Design a binder for these strands. Structure first.
Length: 10
DNA sequence: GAAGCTTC
DNA sequence: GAAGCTTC
């Protein structure tokens, strides 16, 4: 996720 | 190193 | 199935 906690997506 | 997910 | 980057 995020970053942090990529995206989604990318 | 180890956890934090939908979108093509 | 690849398609992704960091907090910690």
């Amino acid at each position: 996720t995020x970053p942090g906690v990529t995206x989604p997506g990318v």
